[PDB]
């Protein structure tokens, strides 16, 4: 019932999926387990699903990661029914194996590595009736019946009846003979189907008939059958009705279907994958117990159900799944944003899915059914474009593998207000309008027009015909697209670029909140997992850097704190305290801060004073000329932790050692590579691997590198603006405003009309106004629905207020609002044109063949090409390799350099 | 150790065998040289 009044949690999908799995899938798989009956003289039992007990893990999460063990839960079932011939029930609680547990955030720790499970999109079983275009005659109508496994059975229609199937190798599969062989009488066959004239004139059970639960529903919805939901088998009446609908569509009575519609596609989750893996593990366990029974009857010894079963299949199956499956991926712990945007991904590719090049161009484009359910902006660039998408904010699975979106009823009913979740197929039949009611034209206010969406088409209708209404601002966008302020003034391409660049952000040493934000950073920091939230209410009696003690109703709860830990992508993690000692707290309130978070909000950058102007060509391309203040004031300083005379007696480098490029610490001794130098914070000896052996292959060492902002680093904003640092200038050489402050960064203005970004100017002006007024702004997207030119008023009012409260007339100048005149730092002369001045939120980024041979041959440099080829390869070595590889297949090659002087042949080997 | 990279070996076969792409492929040079359809020769082999 949650999510109808507020924004749902970012980890609710995987949470409910794992809950559904551990609630029903285990029992569903244990029910289909076969029974092994043997060992007459011996005492045994079968698999009785009556106990079904899961025990809590003995190890803790911290321990598991530290010692590289998977965190998992035990499974003890007392599967005892009756012996074979002893006539005495011997019930013993056997330990089948271990089942991995999911955290509250959705990550499972397997072998010490945080891993996530990405959802998958695929078509649903049913009939589709695609009208394939025919060159000769009428268009051939082919109806494909998809099964749960993935089978395809088509039915064609030519100019005549010509009802044939494509299941057989031949074109004509004798659909009449196929229906007769099904077991139905010919008279009943011709009497049941409508229009028996053309029917009379017309003269597998492993996966095809095994339709899924959703397949029966889809077939009963598309057709007019009333078969109960319990039946999951392809009945002959199904094929009869399919042929009837096909021959009716041939006459014009029918409607085609679109496979791109979300109602025709099903969304898989972690529950289905884990259930399939559990089924495979149960199959392996049945095989193992059958083998050990056949061995025990050979060895002539009465076995024990504990000794008869082995805990190997479940563990090895889950390990292989978490290690080699395309959907199972490692968690991206760069910043708190990648932790929350990684689980919301949808993948079209994978097992039983469309490939990269095999997928047609119609699958990648946006469909009208994707509104409010799949983000139209987020898309993985590259060859896999359009196949990787992000789930919307207000979206959930609808008990049928279908993703649904909330809507508000505006009809005169008993209640009048009910947030309904609508399946993509049911929402199409209602009038959905996204428009305000601020209009009055001397009428009843219900005769006014409003843009609405109906039958996947946009049209303007009166206010009496609308049924549903979308009222949430973040309903259509994902986490990345929502964190962009003033998104209405930018293109979607730059929105995608900004959503991609926000993932590549580095948590800095000291974090600061943005002056202008969207208002979703709070829930992002809440669902990130790097913030210590209180699990109980009480006063804080002891505050320390290592732990926090919370005293409630007598009980004292100890909460640890992360102090300079390493992420998966070389990023430091640290937590700071934000509550003094002796204050009251409630469940869900912040006790300690986190990395890239300050005050419970995401902080991925700093506020800097920025001017937009050309400066000596240093920003001709996309490039930034920054001030030297950002270097000695510790503004863009970050930490990075990498793992691999100073050597001790044993050989390991001691703590506090400052290694340099070329120094060895432990070929025989590990050496730090080029570009890596820092303080060795801690060293751990992996004497015992956990790989099932004690492997001191090596001792893990950690170095810390505080990387100051330098030339070549990439700085990017939240609107798609990207720049590479070109030069650092002193404070005295930078341009200065009329107040006397030197600007920090200088951006090129010509990029603004090129990439079509307008929101950055609004952000800069409003940030300057807020910095002068000591205010922070959190604006919801699409503020023009209130009034036309709302953002202009919001920015200019704050600018004028900052100009009138603090006596700074240069902030808001009437001749050119938003622009101010600045001076040169070298000569102290004003430029002849005003420039944009503001304080935007700048982020620091983490990232700092045959064509060449063709080009070299075009230039004419043969010796350079020869040298390059010999350097890349090392008679030449490539020729010897080729002649050996060819003579390995009974093929002889010779060079035979002929001399033009004496006319003799010389073989070169 | 380049002599090891350049040296090769040979294995004697008790029964003769036939090249992969000299027969099965659509251009059957042996069938074109023996004036016999592919069915019988495939059978002999």
């Amino acid at each position: 019932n949650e999510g109808i009044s507020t924004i749902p949690g970012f980890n609710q999908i995987q949470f409910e999926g794992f809950c559904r799995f551990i609630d029903q899938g285990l029992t569903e798989e244990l029910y289909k387990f076969p029974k092994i009956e043997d060992t007459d003289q011996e005492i045994e039992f079968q698999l009785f699903v009556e106990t079904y007990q899961l025990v809590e893990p003995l190890i803790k999460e911290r321990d598991a990661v530290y010692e590289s063990l998977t965190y998992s839960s035990e499974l003890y079932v007392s599967a005892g029914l009756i012996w074979k011939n002893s006539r005495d029930m011997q019930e013993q609680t056997i330990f089948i194996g271990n089942i991995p547990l999911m955290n509250s955030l959705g990550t499972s720790i397997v072998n010490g590595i945080y891993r996530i499970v990405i959802n998958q999109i695929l078509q649903s079983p049913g009939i589709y009736y695609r009208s394939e275009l025919d060159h000769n005659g009428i268009s051939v109508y082919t109806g494909t019946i998809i099964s749960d496994w993935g089978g395809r059975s088509e039915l064609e229609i030519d100019r005549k009846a010509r009802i044939w199937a494509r299941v057989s190798r031949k074109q004509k599969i004798s659909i009449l003979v196929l229906s007769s062989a099904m077991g139905l009488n010919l008279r009943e066959i011709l009497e049941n189907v409508c229009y028996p004239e053309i029917f009379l004139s017309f003269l597998f059970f492993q996966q095809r008939c095994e339709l899924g639960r959703i397949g029966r529903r889809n077939m009963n919805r598309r057709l007019n059958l009333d078969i109960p939901q319990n039946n999951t088998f392809l009945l002959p009446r199904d094929i009869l009705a399919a042929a009837d609908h096909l021959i009716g569509l041939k006459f014009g009575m029918g409607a085609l279907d679109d496979m791109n519609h979300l109602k025709n596609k099903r969304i898989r989750s972690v529950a289905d994958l884990l259930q399939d893996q559990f089924g495979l593990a149960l199959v392996r366990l049945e095989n193992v117990v059958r083998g050990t029974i056949c061995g025990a009857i050979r060895h002539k010894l009465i076995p024990t159900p504990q000794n008869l079963v082995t805990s190997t299949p479940l563990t090895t199956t889950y390990e292989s799944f978490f290690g080699l499956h395309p959907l199972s991926q490692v968690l991206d712990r760069t910043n708190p944003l990648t932790q929350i945007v990684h689980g919301r991904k949808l993948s079209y590719l994978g097992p039983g899915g469309l490939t990269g090049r095999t997928a047609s161009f119609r699958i990648r484009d946006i469909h009208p059914s994707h509104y409010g359910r799949i983000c139209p902006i987020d898309t993985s660039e590259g060859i896999n474009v359009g196949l990787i998408g992000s789930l919307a904010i207000h979206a959930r699975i609808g008990h049928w593998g279908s993703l649904e979106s909330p809507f508000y009823e505006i009809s005169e009913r008993s209640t009048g207000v009910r947030m309904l979740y609508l399946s993509p197929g049911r929402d199409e039949y209602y009038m959905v309008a996204a428009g305000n009611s601020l209009a009055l034209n001397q009428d009843i206010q219900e005769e006014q027009v409003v843009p609405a969406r109906y039958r996947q088409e946009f049209l303007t209708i009166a206010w009496e015909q609308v049924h549903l209404r979308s009222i949430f601002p973040f309903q259509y966008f994902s986490i990345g697209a929502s964190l962009i302020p003033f998104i209405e003034h930018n293109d979607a391409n730059r929105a995608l670029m900004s959503s991609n660049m926000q993932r590549q952000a580095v948590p800095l040493s000291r974090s600061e909140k943005c002056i202008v934000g969207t208002g979703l950073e709070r829930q992002a920091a809440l669902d990130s997992g790097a913030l210590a939230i209180a699990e109980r209410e009480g006063r804080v009696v002891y505050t320390n850097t290592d732990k926090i003690l919370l005293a409630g109703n007598g009980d004292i709860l100890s909460i640890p704190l992360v102090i300079y830990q390493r992420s998966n992508k070389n990023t430091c993690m640290h937590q700071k305290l934000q509550v003094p000692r002796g204050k009251c707290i409630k469940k869900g309130q912040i006790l300690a801060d986190g990395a890239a978070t300050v005050g419970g909000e995401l902080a991925l950058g700093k506020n800097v004073l920025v001017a937009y102007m050309p400066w000596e060509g240093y920003n001709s391309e996309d490039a930034v000329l920054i001030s030297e203040r950002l270097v000695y004031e510790d503004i863009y300083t970050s930490f990075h932790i990498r793992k691999y005379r100073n050597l001790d007696k044993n050989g390991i480098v001691m703590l506090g050692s400052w290694v340099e490029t070329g120094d060895i610490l432990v070929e025989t001794c590990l050496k730090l590579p080029i570009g890596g130098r820092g303080r060795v914070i801690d060293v751990r000896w992996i004497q015992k691997r956990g790989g099932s052996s004690y492997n001191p292959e090596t001792i893990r060492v950690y170095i810390l590198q505080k990387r100051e902002i330098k030339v070549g680093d990439k700085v990017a904003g939240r609107h798609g603006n990207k720049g590479i640092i070109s030069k650092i200038l002193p404070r005295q050489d930078m341009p200065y405003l009329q107040d006397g402050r030197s600007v920090d960064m200088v951006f090129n203005p010509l990029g603004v009309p090129s990439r079509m970004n307008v929101g950055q100017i609004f952000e800069c002006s409003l940030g300057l106004a807020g910095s002068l007024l000591d205010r922070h702004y959190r604006i919801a997207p699409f503020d023009e629905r209130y009034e036309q030119e709302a953002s202009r008023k919001l920015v200019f009012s704050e600018l004028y207020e900052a100009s009138k409260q603090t006596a700074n007339p240069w902030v808001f100048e009437p001749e050119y609002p938003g622009k101010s005149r600045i001076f040169d730092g070298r000569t102290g002369n004003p430029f002849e044109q005003p420039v944009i001045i503001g304080k935007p939120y700048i982020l620091k980024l983490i990232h700092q063949g045959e064509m060449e041979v063709w080009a070299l041959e075009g230039f004419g440099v043969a010796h350079i090409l020869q040298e390059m080829l010999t350097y890349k390869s090392d008679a030449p070595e490539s020729f010897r390799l080729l002649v050996r590889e060819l003579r390995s297949l009974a093929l002889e090659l010779n060079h035979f350099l002929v001399s033009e002087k004496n006319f003799q042949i010389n073989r070169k080997e | 150790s380049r002599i090891r990279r350049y040296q090769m070996g040979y294995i004697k076969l008790a029964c003769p065998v036939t090249h992969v792409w000299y027969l099965k492929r659509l251009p059957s040079y042996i069938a074109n040289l023996l004036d016999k359809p592919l069915k019988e020769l495939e059978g002999l082999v």
Binding site: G712, L889 | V20
Partner: peptide
């Protein structure tokens, strides 16, 4: 089966 089978760095403007 037998048949079938320099330092990269960013650039700035000077």
């Amino acid at each position: 089966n037998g048949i079938r089978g320099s330092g990269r760095s960013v650039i700035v403007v000077g």
